[PDB]
């Protein structure tokens, strides 16, 4: 063969914090297919929005939106627990099929995106150049979002454990833990990554006894 | 400047499932410094081994070991709650300093790795060629490890939710969930991504009552 069909730009979805998560890497030979299991961002979330992106930037807002669709009827469960398999499938004709399937409810939804969607060759070159020129600022964005997501998990799971420990947690500890949770929740609302890390570390440092109690419960 | 000091190969650590996780990318200019927070792989683990790797392969075993050290004193917590900060620092002389610090306990341990450690030039070129030739198999291993680690988390969070629900969970459900938990555990020990997925899905299907109970 003298030529191959290949993807000029990465293809993926928007994930928690406004990030583009890639499912098909730039320069993949098509036909190609790829699935990845994702989940909900909140407790008891009953739907997910699949927002399909083309491009090389880390902020989903700086990529090219191809379309979106919702999958409904996800049964009540803690955040991160439902199993939503998302599949990108690009055929020999450059048509992209994107689907989401809830492995538990059996529900599925899908869309079809035309070969002619997304950026033209000029916009493709500009997007590559732009990603290169903002590589630092994109990397800092992605890392603030990861830190925020790790801090959010630490916060809600530490709340969950306070609740389970009940009066087994001594008064002074509950106080120090409440103080640290408040400072942490305030930091997660800012855009200062070192501050979030400082506050997560502070929560870690006053949680020793809470964690011992979780050990006793589940052990 | 007419020359730069650059890493010819990625440098990183072994992580859960036996995979290499990069902390300094291939072709970084030195001096350089990079930190990333990692954690325990099991509930109440009191120590981690930091195993320092050089190379472009996904399986830790296919890379060059540059050495390892332990960090202990880690206080009891659920899996992935302790904050273990791993720093790779290569100074202007090409000496790699690896340390780990437990942000809780404040304990810290390090090792220094000579500039001449690791693969020679011929070996670097074979490493880059082997990584290219096994790109697909390496991706599949990595995906297998990711799925497994996901099932492992599903397994333990489900176990703790059964413990917490206690006698609120009906007898039929305690037994079904436990049977699906054991099946998922057996699958995680294998190397079939799809069979792990089917077992994570079967566990979900019998865990419905558990999820409502958990919600309160």
């Amino acid at each position: 063969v003298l030529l191959l069909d290949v993807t000029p730009l990465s293809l993926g979805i928007e994930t928690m914090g406004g990030v583009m998560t890639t499912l098909i890497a730039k320069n993949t030979t098509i036909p190609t297919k790829h699935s990845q299991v994702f989940s909900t961002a909140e407790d008891n979330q009953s739907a997910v929005t699949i927002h399909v992106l083309q491009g090389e930037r880390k902020r989903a807002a700086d990529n090219k939106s191809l379309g979106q669709f919702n999958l409904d009827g996800i049964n009540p469960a803690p955040r991160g627990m439902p199993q939503i398999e998302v599949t990108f499938d690009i055929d020999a004709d450059g048509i992209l099929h994107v689907s989401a399937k809830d492995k538990n409810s059996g529900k599925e939804q899908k869309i079809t995106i035309k070969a002619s969607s997304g950026l033209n060759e000029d916009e493709i070159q500009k997007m590559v150049r732009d990603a290169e020129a903002n590589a630092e600022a994109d990397r800092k964005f992605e890392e603030l979002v990861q830190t925020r997501n790790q801090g959010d998990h630490l916060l809600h799971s530490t709340r969950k454990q306070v609740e389970e420990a009940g009066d087994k947690l001594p008064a002074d500890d509950k106080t120090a833990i409440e103080s640290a949770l408040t400072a942490l929740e305030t930091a997660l609302k800012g855009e200062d990554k070192a501050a979030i890390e400082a506050k997560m570390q502070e929560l870690a440092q006053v949680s020793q006894k809470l964690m011992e109690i979780a050990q006793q419960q589940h052990a | 400047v007419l020359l730069l000091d650059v890493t010819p190969l990625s440098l990183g650590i072994e992580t859960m499932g036996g995979v290499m996780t990069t902390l300094i990318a291939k072709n970084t200019t030195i001096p350089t410094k990079h930190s990333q927070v990692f954690s325990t792989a099991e509930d109440n683990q009191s120590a981690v081994t930091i195993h320092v790797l050089q190379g472009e392969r996904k399986r830790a075993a296919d890379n060059k070991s540059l050495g390892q050290f332990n960090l202990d004193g880690i206080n009891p917590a659920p899996r992935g709650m302790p904050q273990i900060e791993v720093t790779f620092d290569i100074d202007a002389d090409g000496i790699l300093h690896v340390s780990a610090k437990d942000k809780n306990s404040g304990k810290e341990q390090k090792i220094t790795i000579k500039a001449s450690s690791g693969l020679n030039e011929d070996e670097i070129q074979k490493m880059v060629r082997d990584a290219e030739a096994n790109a697909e198999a390496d991706r599949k291993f990595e995906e297998l490890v990711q799925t497994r680690n996901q099932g492992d988390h599903l397994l333990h969070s489900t176990r703790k939710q059964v413990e917490e629900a206690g006698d609120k969970l009906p007898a039929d459900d305690k037994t079904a969930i436990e049977s699906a938990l054991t099946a998922l555990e057996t699958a995680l020990k294998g190397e079939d991504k799809a069979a792990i997925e089917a077992k994570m899905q079967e566990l979900a299907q019998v865990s419905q009552k558990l999820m409502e109970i958990a919600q309160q």
């Binding site: - | 072994e14 859960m16 499932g17 954690s39 792989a41 099991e42 120590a47 081994t49």
Partner: peptide, 10 residues
């Protein structure tokens, strides 16, 4: 068997 593995911070 004791665990020494490093996992990801959640």
């Amino acid at each position: 068997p004791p665990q020494w593995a490093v996992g990801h911070f959640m």
